[PDB]
Design a binder for these strands. Structure first.
Ligand code: NA
Length: 163
DNA sequence: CGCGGACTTC
């Protein structure tokens, strides 16, 4: 776990929620993410101030996390648009810019296995509980990421070299 | 026309 623990050192952790599975699959295919405006600004600021920003993905009502990734850029505007599957009532403009992300683990973790972890930055609720963009305290986020199964096909060299 | 937008078994 040496490489993973190096990637997680002094990181800030944010829960990411998706209304659908398709956009998380697209994010896994293309290494990008978009979020709503308040979260977009929060993530840009965190990227500029923190050693690493870790996004922990969870599809709404799925009962699981779907993986985690490290932000490798601030959100970009004006480029070729990502063709997200738009939830009902959401527009393409609402998703704003596009972050580049490097996946660290693309395996699932069921909520049953994280039930012992509570988040002191969210009223000490189980870490599975949170809106999109909910920040997770350092120790809680680190232990949560360490619970995921190894992703045998990910090469962490690119992440580590960027850092 | 900009208009407010991706929690958890309640
Ligand atoms: Na997938």
């Amino acid at each position: 776990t040496s490489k993973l623990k190096y990637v997680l050192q002094d990181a800030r952790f944010f829960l990411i929620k998706s209304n659908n599975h398709e956009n998380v699959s697209l994010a896994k295919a293309k290494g990008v993410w978009s979020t709503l405006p308040v979260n977009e600004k929060k993530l840009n600021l965190a990227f500029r101030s923190a050693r690493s920003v870790i996004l922990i993905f969870s599809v709404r009502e799925s009962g699981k996390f779907q993986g985690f990734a490290r932000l490798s850029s601030e959100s970009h505007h004006g480029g070729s648009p990502i063709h997200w599957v738009l939830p009902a009532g959401m527009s393409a403009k609402m998703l704003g810019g596009v972050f580049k992300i490097d996946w660290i683990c693309r395996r699932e973790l069921p909520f049953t296995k994280s039930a012992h972890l509570t988040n002191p930055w969210n009223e000490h609720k189980p870490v599975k509980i949170g809106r999109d963009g909910q920040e997770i305290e350092l120790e809680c986020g680190t232990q949560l990421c360490l619970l995921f199964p190894p992703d045998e096909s990910i090469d962490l060299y690119q992440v580590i070299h960027k850092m």
